[PDB]
Structures are given as C-alpha cells and as structure tokens.
Design a protein around this ligand. Structure first.
Ligand code: K
Ligand code: MG
Ligand code: MG
Ligand code: MG
Ligand code: MG
Ligand code: MG
Ligand code: MG
Ligand code: MG
Ligand code: MG
Ligand code: MG
Ligand code: MG
Ligand code: MG
Ligand code: MG
Ligand code: MG
Ligand code: MG
Ligand code: MG
Ligand code: MG
Ligand code: MG
Ligand code: MG
Ligand code: MG
Ligand code: NA
Ligand code: NA
Ligand code: NA
Lengths: 400, 221
RNA sequence: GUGAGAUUGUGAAGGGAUCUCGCAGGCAUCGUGAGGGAAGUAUGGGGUAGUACGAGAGGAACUCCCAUGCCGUGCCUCUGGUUUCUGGAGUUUGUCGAAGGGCAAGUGCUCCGACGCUAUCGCACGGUGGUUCUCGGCUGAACGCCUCUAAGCCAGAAACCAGUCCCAAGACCGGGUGCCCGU
RNA sequence: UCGAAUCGCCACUUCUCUUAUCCGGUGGGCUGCCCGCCCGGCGCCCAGUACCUUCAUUUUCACAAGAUC
RNA sequence: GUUCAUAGCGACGUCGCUUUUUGAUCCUUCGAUGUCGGCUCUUCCUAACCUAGCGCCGCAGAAGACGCUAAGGGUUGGAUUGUUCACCCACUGACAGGGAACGUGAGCUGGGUUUAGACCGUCGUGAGACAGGUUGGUUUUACCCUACUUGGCUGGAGAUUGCGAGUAAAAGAUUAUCCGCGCAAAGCGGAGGCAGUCCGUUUUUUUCUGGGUCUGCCGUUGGGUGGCAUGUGCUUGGCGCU
RNA sequence: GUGUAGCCCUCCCGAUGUAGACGUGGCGUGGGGGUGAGGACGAAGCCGAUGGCGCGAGCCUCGGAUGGACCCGCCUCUAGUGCAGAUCUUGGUUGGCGUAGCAAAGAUCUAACGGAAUAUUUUUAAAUGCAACGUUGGAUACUGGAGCGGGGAAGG
RNA sequence: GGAAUGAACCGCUUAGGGAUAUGUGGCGUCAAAACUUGUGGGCUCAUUCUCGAUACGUGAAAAGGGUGUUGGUGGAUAUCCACCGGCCCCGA
RNA sequence: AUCGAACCACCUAGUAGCUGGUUCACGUCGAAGUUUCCCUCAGGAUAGCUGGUGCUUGUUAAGAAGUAUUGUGCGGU
RNA sequence: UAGGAAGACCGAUAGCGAACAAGUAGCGUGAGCGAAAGUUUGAAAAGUACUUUGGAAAGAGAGUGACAUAGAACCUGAAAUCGUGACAACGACAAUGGAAGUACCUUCAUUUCUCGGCCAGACCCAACCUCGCCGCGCAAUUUCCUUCCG
C-alpha cells in the first residue's frame, strides 16, 4: 500500500556517512581550474576563527526596494598571520592519477615547523632535517637539487608549495598548540617554467594574505563543523515527534522498513554521531582586509565614523581574546567553533553575478561587549556616562 | 614487487642480480573483445603468464549507440539496501577486459583466482613494456578475419568514454609521445641493419664452394 | 651457520640427539583517487506592453532585473526561549535568646539574570561541461521524378554520464619526504 | 641458514599503418590486360668445414649426477 | 460532427493485456505466521495531475482538446463519519493512480470487529437466537544471530606458506666502470698530486690511513651593515676553525 | 557332504527396493546343566595415532608410568536380553555470561582507638598495598505524638 | 546419466571393481570434446525490461500493419498491376 | 491462590476406530490405495495383489501363452 | 507369637517407600502426602609427631603404610564440560561428510639383510585388440563416350 499523503524525505543522502572527520584541519579537496594566460599566483590561505560581530553599510542595487539605503549584516573575524613557504612539490599525470615527482626543501626551517614531526618535542633529540642541512649546499647537494628541478620542468603538470602557519606570532592564550599547521597551496597561471620561478622566489619568505585576496572578492571556506557527540534521530535528521500517548518513547522513527526487503536500508534515519564533519560552503564575500594593531591602531575607524578603535570588542572576544595580527572580515557565518584553523580558497563558481560583483563600503563597525547586553562602543563612553567612582576617588586620595 | 630487506640481503649473499619470468605480450589492437577473452582465459588455465597492451583499441560488433545502451543497462544494477556491497562498475578499458576474462574462469576456487592473478592488462604500451620484446597477435580474433566490411563496429576506448572514463586524453598524449621516440630510434640503426645485410651478402664468395650449394638447394641463398 | 627455548607420566647429578622460533625493519608527515554516494526545485512581480493578434470585446512571449514557497548545508552578531552561575534582590511559615548571619519547606515562592544550547520565532550560503531520445533539418541514392534515410553530416528535454561536493588503498599506492637501525 | 620445481636469447626482434589492399615500394601503354624502374638473426659440440683433438669402471632406463636465478 | 467516417467521437461485431475488485478452487499453515483503520518512515511502478521538450486541431489572441519522449522533482489545511470510500468549505502550479505478507501492533493507538455484565425490537412454549441497534470491557518478552547506525584494535601479495622473482621506474663493460647540455643524435664541457698496510689470475687492480693544497660546506667570534611583521632566522665584509 | 575357516575342482544363470513375509553350524548380554581352562609372575572394570581379522553385527592381540580379586572358550537350557529422539524418567554438565541487573522510603563527614586486615617496594616525599569494618567524642541531618516512641491480644 | 534448476519429461533401470563401445545431450570459455572442423549452401541488423538461440514448458502472446530485405504465382508492355511465402520491425 | 458443581483417598494401570514412541547384522523374495456388505465415509469384515510350506508330476509338452495365421460368429463408435 | 527350610529371583535409579537414628526429615488448616542417603580408607588408625611461612584456613618439607594419585563421605574412578604445555595450521564458501593423491608424523604390524614376499626396465610363449599396404565379384561402370552432318 502506498502512503496516504506525500512529503519529501528528511536529510541529504550525498553527505554520507555521518562519521567523524579524519583530520581537524580544513583541507581543500580540489583547486580552481588553471588558466595559463594569467600571471602565476597563490590560491589559498590558512586562518583562525576569532568571533563574530555586525556592521552597517549602504547597498547599491537598482530595481530593489532596499536600494540606496542602510542595512545591518553580521560578519565573522578571522586572524591571518603571514605564512612561510618551505617546500616545492611537482605532480605528473598518469593513466591512473597524479603522482608526486619529488620535493625541494628550503634549507632553513623554524622550530615551530619541526615541532610537527614529534609527539614530545622537548624530551627528544630534535634531529629532524639535520642531515639534509649538512648536505644541501655542498657540491653534491647543488647537483641533486638541479636534477630534481629538471624533472619538474620536463614532466610536471601541477606545481604546489608547502607552507606552514606561524603560531609564535599568533600570541593566543587559548590556542594551546605550538606545532605549526602544514598544508599545500597550488600555483595557478603561467607556464611550468614561470610557475617554478615564482616558487623559488617565495622560498624561506613570508606570504601575507593581502597578496592572495582582494577587498571585495569572494572565497570558499573549507572547515570542520562543531561536534555534538552521539545524538538521536530528531536532532540528527529532523523527523517528527510521536503523539504524547506512545508507549516506550516519543523521539523515534516508528517504522524502519517494510517486511520485504527483509533488511534495513541505508536510507532510513538512525541515531549516531552528529557534527564534526568537513564542509565547503562556497561564495563568501570579503568585506575588509585589516592589518596588525601594532602598525595600524585605527582598525575599525570608518570615513563615516571617526572614532579611533580596534576590531576587538569591549572585554575581548569570548573564549578567544585579542586580535593582535592581520585579519579578514567575511559576510555571514563560518563553520566550526572559535580557535579552529580554517582554509580559504579562491572560488570555483562563476563570479559574474551582480551580487558577487558589488563593491562594498562599510559605514559602522560594532565593538560593544559580547558579554551581556553591551551598550558602550569604547571605554571612554563608559567613563563619560559614569563620573568618578568610589575606587577612582580612593586612588586619588592615596596619590595625595 | 617491492623487495624488502630480507629479499635484497638474500640476493646479495647469493650473488643474484636480475630475473625475468617467461611472459607473452599481446598487442590487442583491432581484436574482437569476446573472442580474445575466450582464447586468453583458456591459456591462463594452462599455466601461462600474459600481458596485454593497448586495451583501448578492442572492437565490439554493432553501433556505438547499441553498445553504450548495453553498458547503461549493466550500470543500473545495484544492491538497493547497500550499494557499496553491490556489483562494481569499472570504467577503464583495461578493467573491462579483466572483468570479461574473469567471467570465463572459475573465480570461486583457488585455481581460478591464481589464473586471474597472471594477467596484467595495461592501456597503451607503458615504458616498462616497450623494450621487453616483440609483441604477438591472435589471428582468430583479428576483426579483419571476423567482421564483414560493411558492418559497423565500436572501439572500446570511445565507448568507455561517455560512461565515466576520464583518461582518454592522457592515454592518447602518451601514445603519441611513444610513437615519435620509437620512430626516431628505428630510423637510427638503419646503418647497422644495412651493414649486417651487406655482411650476409658477400659472405658468399667467401664461404667454401660446397656450403653455398647446400644453401642454394634449400632456398636460403 | 648463529642466538634463544623445549623434550612436562616411575629420585638426583652429567653429556648427546632432535624439534620450534628469530636473523630486519621502525616511527612520523604531505599527498593520489579506483570504487560507492550524490540535490536543488517551484511560484510571483517589474520591463517588454495595453505591444503583437483581433471589426470589437479582449489580450501574448524571449534577453534582463527584483522577491518569495519547499528542501538542503551551517552559524549565534542581533531578537526570542531556556537558569542548579540556587548570581543579586524581595517575600511566607518554622528554627538558632535578639540584631547581624544563616538554615528547613527532596530547587519554599516572586522579579531580574550572564556564559552555553537553541528557533525559517533569528542570520548566511546552495556552480560547470558532454553523449543522446521524441523531433526538426542539410547533402543524397535505391527508383536518369521524389524522399530528413539506406551511407554520411548538423541542431538538440526537468532525462543520462562526468566535473564541483561526502567517504575513501581488502583498490593492499614500485606516490613523495624526515630521522633511527641493518648492510 | 638454502637441499629445492622452472630449462632460448639478441643494442639485426624489441617502430607505425592497411586487409575493397601495387603485401617491398613505384611509373607507362591500350575499363581489364600488357610493359618497365630502384632497393626476423643467431643458437644445436674445432670461433668453423679444415688437417688436429681428453672423454670410459657412472661398464642397459631412473630429476640433467649438469646449468640459470 | 454547419457539407465532412476517422479535429474529436464512434454503434453492430471482433482481438487482447493487468492482477489494484469480487467470485471459483482448496496447494501450504489448526503441538497458533497477532486478524480493520489511522499515526510515523523509507522505497519502487506508470496506465502522466503539475513542472521540461515537441506535433496536431473544428488552434485568429487568450483559454483548451488530443498525441509522443519523459517517473528527475512535487502533489495541501479542515467540518460530519471507526471507517476505506464519499460529500462539502477553502488554498494552490497541482491538489494523479498504484505496489511493497490488502508494507509497517516485541513501532504506537484500540474507535470498529469478536468472550464473559446489561437494555430494546423481531423470532422461540423454553433454555436461547439475530452478518439488527446500544452501553462497559488486561495490548506481555530482546541481554542472542543477522541487517542498519555510529565507535575502536589489528593482520595481510603463493591474500597468513616458497626460497614461486612480472614496477603505468631508469637505460647499458648484460644497466657494472663518474657528472652536465643535446632528439635512445651529430657533437661540445668538468675532473687534485705523494707515501703505507692489508688484499691481489688485469686493464693507471680492490682498499685504509698519514700528511698533501684546496673549491663548495657545518659550527664561531665580535664588530659594521642590511631584509623579513617587530625576541628569531638569515645575507653581505674579515678571525681562526673543522 | 542343507547350513562352518564352506570336502575339493570346473561351468551356467540371477543380484536395487518402502509396507510386509521368511532364512542364517549369524553377532552380542544376565543366569542353569555339562565339559575344558585362566589368575597376586596380577581377575573383572576403565583408557587408546595398538594393530590384525570379518561384507557386517563384532572378535582378538598389544601398551597403561591403570586397577587389586575373581573369570572365561565350546555344547546345550533359560530370560526383567541390545536405544538417538516418546513437549520420555532421574542425576550431572552447559553457551547465553562476568551479561540483565542489585535505582521507592532524602545522607553522611571528621579525629582517636580496635583489628591480621598497614605507612606491606631492594628489581628522597606523589607518579609501586588499593578498597572496606566497629566503638567513643565532634559535626550534619531524618522520624515529627495516626512516630524506624512506650505497653498488650492472636501468632511465634 | 541428460534437459542450468524440478517426485512424474528424455535415456537407462541398479552385487564390488578394471578395459572397450554407446544412449539421451553435446564439442567459444566456465566444462570433457571440431586447440573457433568442412577444400557446404542460403537468410537475418533487432536504440533504453536491451534481436535470436535445448522439446514437455500458456517456464508467454493475438487480430491488424511495414518495397526493411530475400523468394514465388497470375496478367499487360518491351516497366506496371494483383496475390502468397521466409527472416526482421510495429502492435507489446 | 482450587468452583456452569471444593478438597482428600479409593474403584483406576477407567475406555480411546484418535496423537506420539517402539532398541543387533547380512541374505532370499516383495505390494496396495480396487470389489461387495456394515449408523458405514479418519474404522472393520470379504475378494484381489504378496510370503512361507508344500503335494502331484515332466524332460520334448499334460488342462501352457496380455502374440500371430486360417476358418467361422458378434457389434452401430 | 516362636522357630525352621529354601530359590535357574533383585543386586543400591534394582529389590518393600525404607540394605543407613524410614513411615524418619519435610509438606498440608485437615483428611492425608512422603523422600534423598552403601561411613566400600586401610590387614591393622599405624588417622601425618616435628621444622618453616601464614591471623586462620592452608602451603612447602619430614614421617606411617606394600600402595597417600588409599588423607577421612578417603575401593575402582567413565562420559559430557574446563585449565595447562607442546604442536598443526587456517582468510572470508558455517562446519561435518565422500573419493583419490600428496606433504609431514608415527611407543603399529609384516618381510629382508648375500640371499630378498622390495622398486624399476627390457625380452619370450599363449590370448585378445588395433594400424598400414594390396586386392576381388556384380551390366556398377551405355539414360554414357568419340567422330561426320543438319
Ligand atoms: K548513480
Ligand atoms: Mg499505553
Ligand atoms: Mg553574548
Ligand atoms: Mg557510482
Ligand atoms: Mg563517481
Ligand atoms: Mg508466534
Ligand atoms: Mg512474526
Ligand atoms: Mg513488526
Ligand atoms: Mg414471546
Ligand atoms: Mg534385496
Ligand atoms: Mg536377570
Ligand atoms: Mg543411553
Ligand atoms: Mg552491568
Ligand atoms: Mg523534619
Ligand atoms: Mg508508634
Ligand atoms: Mg576443453
Ligand atoms: Mg508414528
Ligand atoms: Mg526383486
Ligand atoms: Mg531404593
Ligand atoms: Mg525409593
Ligand atoms: Na489400563
Ligand atoms: Na444397520
Ligand atoms: Na492420520
């Protein structure tokens, strides 16, 4: 017998299994299609989630009821210290897939990079990359590197660079890890010879996020979702609850199959792990590319709001702290909790729509406290509402 | 494959350097799929080691539309309750040949599993097979003794594309590179081939007068 | 050959014979992607335009633009809900001699209440190419007329396949790299 | 440490294409006949066809009691 | 059907298909396969209601009829009734039809049906009967195997053994006996000398040390620069040094 | 000389079978009448990679690093005479399984003492003797006079 | 022992074993046999539940259509008309 | 803890055309589900099919035959 | 109630319910119902003095005895089920099963050892079964062949 009435199935079958991610780091599975006409450039960057806020701006959109008016849009702040490039890898194409040719190392690596190869770095001999350093610049060392670079030129189709983040510069108290996060970034544009030239120039040097993305562009966000543990079918899949009178419980699926086939099928909802999955979530628009507060104190100052303030809210980002580095501001939400490392990628979908080509001009950035109902923008506003307090008077009296 | 330290150490003590088993390399260009698979499967059961190359040049009788529809019917079959257990639909031409041969073997006994282990089935002619030796053909399945001229036929590579195979451009790029390298090398050493030919000639008039007559009697000189 | 064991049914010392096992990898990282899954879908408005057609009456459509319904993947800046931070305050009966400070009433009860969790009750986002069917044509015979069909060629559905997306080497990767050990 | 089964090999084979196709290519004369032109190998018992030269009792088959790896 | 068999229909006849109705049978089950409907949830079919693409009309425009390819996606909220079915009120692009043991009770519910109490009508002399109406009437057990959902530990290439040797690797005294450019070319470039021991059937034999002068390097010293995002690494210029 | 280890040697013809019938110098068990043996230099019973014989039911030898007092061959007579299942009877053992659980009546903490129940290490102190018991003092709390108060009948 | 599978179909009917030859059924692989036999003829192309291929086995098909192609029969004229088969296609 | 007739012992091992069970080997043979009668239709008696024991005989046929030939009758599909 | 005589009987789940402190223990308001259980260690208690660890129970030694694996519910001591040492290997076809070989094990049996009942090869005689090569009969080879014409 058919169903009495029709309604669509719950959930998406293209995100199976709902199992825990193999790694915590966000990783780009695919990279944008290479265009040989453009100049060589990098395609991704690594950032850390550092809380949320909202802004005000004027929208330019002819034919819309909101044209030439102000709107309020929530945003996400992500800290972006510069990355360091340490390696070059080349790939060749075979009838069975892509295979790595080799690797060229930078001969000078930091302690935080070599921490990634140990589980107890302090109580260890710390011998990683020691023999390569003693051999790289010798006469046999230069010949060996020239041999590998020749194989890159002759029989490669893809060039990538090995880069790691700098966790020493990101002086965060709640991020406990001291070993760098390492990933691969593809170089797009130009020929193979030109791609290798850019990679060699960017060896041992730092790469800033302003050189990879522009202010009013879009990007993709590879990240790992917040975890929820073992959860039931109502929260995991979104099925309806049963009537109050049900014996043995309500938060269940009543029928998990028919008599035939004589088994449970993979399309029926069951309880299990929820959250901590990898997602991609394309088309997030960049609203601002900031700089470190040590060099540019007025981060949140706007042409329409001349107050001198930084991007950090009053009392700090809850659970994270201060933003002491460069940052990016993205429109909307981002997967994962605070302190997690996130990969931003240049887009795959076409970027010719009017929404994606709009130019953004901010007008106001909110910096009130996120604890409680914040109602002051700066610390001077609070000290102007209240006059001198009891503790201020005592300090002055002691000063006398 | 991948000799461990146990294997390399034993070879070092014994003094062995290299070894190559007796293998037949078959060029599968312009061969009927079903007839070649049946001949090869019987030879595998008789204790032979066979490597087949250029699996993308196998031919099937009928039009491309007819054969593409036949594959799409096979692709429709899957275990409804758990498709990851169901039949697996391989897409490369070399995988299709191995599946066809497997269905002509007893595959649920150790004897048949061992026989299937002796077939390699490359696509194109890889670099590790080029210089091994001369290739062979199967005259009973050569498609110029098998098909009438006016009948339409399908090339396996073209049919494997359009149903999921995504390495047609890679295979044709590598094959063209091989032809140029092999053609350049073969034009070289034309001097030594001519010199040997000019050596067998004029060897006569240097041999004794009786051995030349025996050669003439048997049609060798 | 060499290094460890065992020969355990009717004392305790010695030697012999034989049988088993080991004689080479380990840890740590960056990737590949066969195969399997697979997702976006629909309505309205602006303009076209009171235009095309029509005696009149009546009355279209494509490019382009702006919104919304259902579904999907996430998030907590704002708004709402939730309080065993029993946080701060208030208040009833009993109780410690009174005030202070408390305690009991399985959280006594009332108000406000952070962090966290959460709601289409709040916010953000939801792509690209090919092979073809029905059908429509071009050249063109059979059949010195013709014919979209016999050979050949072109265009082409919310269908099908691949890309993007999720899992991924029992798919046994002779893919790369760092250090230790043996040779 | 291991006694093992397997018993052609080559820097002349180890390039390509056709079968309604000059099957080594290739022109001419009058719709098939006729006439011209040019260019796998070794290996099997003297390193080579020739004079010379040790084969035993392992004294009638037995995994070649010998090789390769 | 304005005339016009076939736009659309189509009588009198005749040929089929389906198993979603009801009959016919009695093959399996009576030391028991839980018997209606609704709720919840997944999947399949097409004989296509809406959405996509085409042809044709008794298709001026608009609105429609019919036919073909198409099952990718969708198909509602309520009043009375236990209902399935039906009928009304509204919304909508549309409110299509079916299968899965008449899907689904160790998933629920228990209104209906179908025990024991009791009332009515008709029937019976009576005990009692009625597929007639009415009211009240226990819904038991998973900790086993498999399936499914997540969660971990660990072997394995003769898929645990053989010593049973096949690279989507290079290209040569049979990979030995050096590096760079070049097309598996033509050709063109670079290389430190001395003495000893132990080994040595050859061609400047194979090694092990000591000075022997060192290009390229590692680890330094300060001092002057200089770059990077700025407590940590480097590059230039001299000290001796391995 | 029906039938046995068939008195022996040639030759010819048939050979399966449920329910059922019949045959066998066919096998095995407890006891009686006869006959002939065996046993403390080890009877019965028990065990087995102990083999040999027979189509088979079975028989016999061997070893016990088993046992410690009875027992068998043959001819006959006799019967409470042969087990895989009866939701069979009586004992024993068993996976499930160190599993399901041991969740009403609010609740204990601290020091000293007692105790074999510790402060147990030979290969600085914590990371190598845990957990739990009674009494007394102190703290906290419950019953809340229709009481886990103080006395009786029935019953014990 | 054969028809992949089946109480009943085909062959054959049964003491324990060798050699030889057959029956039904077969000789591309699974799988023994034409290592894909003939120095024998014809016919057939079948696009979405996918041409056809072992009887019993309705263990699936009809009426009605098609110059798709290959054969016959009977009439006019030096190609035309009517009718009937085979294989394939629609009806499905 | 028992009620459309309590409990205890006995008649009582009540009767059952119905359900379940029924313990060694080899050898020679080997069926029936049909007829008539029965308060008979899930059962019997009776004949048929089978086994055992034979009797009387014979060595080409005695009173042989699921088959032909010749002669001579019958029949209404 | 006292004696006697026996048995082709049963032999501890049998024979009386009772081989034993049995109409007992136990059950039921009651009438009534009603078991299990061989103390069978050894000829003889000679029933383990004493040393050492342990709170004790016990363990490790010593001793009695022909035997202590005869140690006290103690003759013999089976099967089901379990622990330990050694070994054999083995993917997933649930295992078990049949046939025919092979690789390792055999506290088994029989034969031989200067002739052998061992293992192979070739040869001879008889019998049976095949292949090559060479032929015959028939008016089967005249519904035919060959010439010259119309
Ligand atoms: K699919
Ligand atoms: Mg209930
Ligand atoms: Mg907040
Ligand atoms: Mg797939
Ligand atoms: Mg795929
Ligand atoms: Mg049941
Ligand atoms: Mg059931
Ligand atoms: Mg159920
Ligand atoms: Mg009356
Ligand atoms: Mg018999
Ligand atoms: Mg007796
Ligand atoms: Mg028994
Ligand atoms: Mg538990
Ligand atoms: Mg109280
Ligand atoms: Mg009281
Ligand atoms: Mg065969
Ligand atoms: Mg019976
Ligand atoms: Mg018989
Ligand atoms: Mg008794
Ligand atoms: Mg008794
Ligand atoms: Na009786
Ligand atoms: Na009667
Ligand atoms: Na019966």
């Amino acid at each position: 017998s058919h169903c009495k009435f029709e309604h669509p199935r719950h959930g998406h079958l293209g995100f199976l299994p709902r199992k825990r991610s193999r790694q915590i780091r966000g990783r780009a599975r695919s990279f944008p299609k290479d265009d040989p006409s453009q100049k060589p450039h990098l395609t991704s960057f690594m950032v850390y989630k550092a809380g949320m806020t909202h802004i005000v701006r004027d929208v330019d959109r002819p034919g819309s009821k909101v044209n030439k008016k102000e709107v309020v849009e929530p945003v996400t702040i992500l800290e972006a210290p510069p990355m360091v490039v340490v390696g070059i890898v080349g790939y060749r194409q075979t009838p069975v897939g892509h295979k790595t040719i080799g690797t060229v190392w930078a001969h000078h690596t930091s302690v935080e990079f070599r921490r990634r190869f140990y589980k107890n770095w302090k109580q260890s001999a710390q011998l990683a990359f020691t023999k390569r350093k003693q051999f790289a610049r010798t006469t046999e060392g230069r010949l060996a590197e020239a041999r590998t670079l020749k194989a890159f030129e002759k029989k490669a189709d893809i060039i990538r660079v090995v880069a790691h983040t700098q966790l020493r510069k990101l002086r965060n108290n709640r991020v406990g890890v001291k070993k760098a996060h390492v990933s691969e970034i593809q170089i797009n544009g130009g020929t193979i010879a030109q791609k290798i030239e850019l990679a060699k120039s960017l060896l041992e040097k730092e790469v800033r996020i302003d050189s990879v993305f522009q202010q009013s562009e879009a990007c993709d966000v590879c990240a790992v979702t917040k975890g929820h543990g073992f959860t039931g079918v109502v929260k995991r899949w979104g099925v309806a609850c049963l009537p109050r009178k049900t014996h043995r419980g309500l938060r269940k699926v009543a029928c998990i199959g028919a008599w035939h086939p004589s088994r449970v099928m993979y399309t029926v909802a069951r309880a299990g792990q929820h959250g901590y999955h990898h997602r991609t979530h394309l088309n997030k628009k960049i609203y601002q590319l900031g700089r470190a507060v040590s060099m540019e104190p007025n981060q949140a100052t706007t042409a329409y709001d001349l107050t001198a303030k930084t991007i950090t809210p009053m009392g700090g980002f809850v659970g994270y702290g201060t933003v002491r580095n460069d940052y990016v501001m993205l429109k909307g939400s981002v997967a994962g909790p605070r302190r997690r490392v996130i990969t931003l990628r240049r887009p795959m979908a076409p970027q010719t729509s009017r929404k994606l080509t709009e130019k953004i001009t901010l007008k106001f950035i909110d910096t009130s406290s996120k604890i409680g109902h914040g109602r002051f923008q700066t610390k001077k506003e609070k000290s102007q509402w209240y006059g001198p307090l009891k503790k201020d008077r005592i300090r002055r009296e002691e000063r006398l | 494959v991948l000799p461990s330290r146990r294997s390399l150490n034993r070879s070092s003590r014994k003094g062995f350097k290299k070894h190559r088993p007796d293998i037949i390399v078959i060029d599968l260009k312009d061969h009927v799929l079903g007839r070649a698979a049946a001949i090869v499967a019987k030879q595998l059961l008789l204790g032979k080691k066979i490597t087949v190359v250029r699996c993308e040049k196998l031919t099937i009788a009928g039009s491309e539309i007819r054969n593409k529809i036949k594959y799409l019917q096979f692709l429709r079959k899957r275990k409804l309750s758990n498709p990851k257990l169901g039949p697996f639909h391989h897409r490369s031409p070399s995988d299709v040949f191995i599946r066809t041969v497997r269905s002509m073997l007893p595959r649920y006994t150790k004897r048949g599993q061992r026989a299937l282990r002796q077939l390699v089935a490359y696509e194109g002619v890889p670099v590790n097979v080029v210089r091994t030796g001369g290739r062979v053909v199967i005259p009973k399945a050569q498609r110029h003794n098998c098909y009438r001229n006016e009948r339409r036929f399908t090339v396996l590579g073209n049919m494997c594309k359009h149903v999921g195979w995504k390495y047609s451009d890679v295979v044709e790029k590598l094959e063209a590179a091989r032809i140029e390298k092999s053609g350049r090398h073969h034009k070289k050493m034309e001097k030594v081939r001519v010199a040997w030919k000019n050596a067998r000639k004029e060897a006569l008039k240097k041999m004794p007068q009786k051995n030349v007559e025996v050669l003439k009697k048997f049609g060798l000189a």
